[PDB]
């Protein structure tokens, strides 16, 4: 699996979101169903939607 890294901090506004900090790494679980991607944080192990433009491949 290819890892993704947060380019900015993000604070959840919906309970289906993940919050995260710049530098945090993710595995992408669903990046194929819209511009928000279901992600699992390697820091926290939590899963949720993140805005795709906030991350880049590691």
Contacts to other proteins by CB under 8 A: 11-17, 19, 27, 29-30, 33-38, 40, 45, 47, 49, 51
Choices 2-10, 24-32, 41-49, 50-58; region in contact with Na ion by CB under 5 A? 41-49
CB of residue 46 vs other proteins: minimum separation in angstroms?
Answer: 9
**Sole binder of Na ion in the list 6, 48, 50, 54 (CB under 5 A):** 48
Report the Cα–Cα distance between both ends of the chain, in Å, rounded. Answer: 11
Q: Find out whether 39 and 10 touch, Cβ atoms under 8 Å.
A: no
Dist CA 33 CA 7 (whole Å)? 21
């Amino acid at each position: 699996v290819t890892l993704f890294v947060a380019l900015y901090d993000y604070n959840a506004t919906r309970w289906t979101d993940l919050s995260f900090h710049k530098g945090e790494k993710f595995q992408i679980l669903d990046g194929d169903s819209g511009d928000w991607w279901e992600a699992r944080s390697l820091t926290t192990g939590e899963t949720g939607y993140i805005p795709s433009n906030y991350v880049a491949p590691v």
